[PDB]
RNA sequence: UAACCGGAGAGGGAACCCACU
């Protein structure tokens, strides 16, 4: 049944237990931004990483 | 850390309004009601109660974004009649429905207990 | 021509000189050696 | 006919391996 309106869905839904995994690729280990941070030494371009 | 806190779904910030009214310029006798910190729980019963009124020509609601907590209800009524009084009549009928339902429920609960 | 410090910067205690600065040190080492060696000695085989 | 304070952009590199789209 729809969780919002309560009307039952016209199609019938395939559902059941399935063994899922959680991978190590979060988003909080990947998000990063920059606005004029640190600078490399030899050429004065920004850092990497 | 970008997680919004759990209370933000139902708590008005300072300076926010629970309700805002804006006239719809495209067609006459139509108005948009914006409700802050409410969801389908309130909008669906408001829409269904508005659709029992024959003097209501249009009634609908939407959530603009699920991560946002807002709901918009568009009401259009016949001339001689206002969408605002349509809305408050729908509320004061829906409260009457819930009060009657509560009374009959507690009576049936007492009657189930050895009766 | 030997390039300046900006071309071959030296980091501080990992001072550690550049890969190019060590080569320049080898250059001036054997240049001073060959200079004094051809000046005094003139061995004509060591110079080769 | 009165009363005490004060200083700020740090911080490197090469090589190899694993992994993501």
Protein described:
Chain A has 49 residues and is low in regular secondary structure. Helix content of chain A is 0%, strand content 0%. The two termini of chain A are 47 Å apart. Chain B is an alpha+beta fold and 115 residues long. Helix content of chain B is 36%, strand content 23%. A four-stranded antiparallel sheet of chain B has the order 1-2-4-3, covered by helices on one side. In chain B, a hairpin with a 6-residue loop joins strand 1 (19-23) and strand 2 (30-36). Chain C has 48 residues and is mainly alpha-helical. The A-B interface holds A 4-6, 28 and B 1, 40, 44. The structure holds one RNA strand of 21 nucleotides. Chain B: Its main location: nucleus. Chain B: Residues 31-103 form the DNA-directed RNA polymerase RBP11-like dimerisation domain. Chain B: One of its GO terms (biological process) is transcription by RNA polymerase II. Chain B: One of its GO terms (molecular function) is DNA-directed RNA polymerase activity.
Features:
part of a larger assembly, 3 chains, A: little secondary structure, elongated, B: 115 residues, alpha+beta, Gyrase A, domain 2, flat, RNA-binding, transcription, DNA, RNA Polymerase
Structural class from helices and strands of chain C? mainly alpha
Work out the count of structural domains of chain B: 1
Order of helices and strands of chain B: EEHEEH
Content-based structural category of chain B: alpha+beta
The main sheet of chain B comes to: 4 strands, antiparallel
Q: Report the span from N to C terminus of chain B.
A: 56 Å
Instruction: Report the principal-axis shape of chain B.
Output: flat
PDB class: transcription
Keywords: DNA, RNA Polymerase, dsif, PAF1c, SPT6, transcription
Entry title: Structure of activated transcription complex Pol II-DSIF-PAF-SPT6
Chain A: DNA-directed RNA polymerase subunit beta
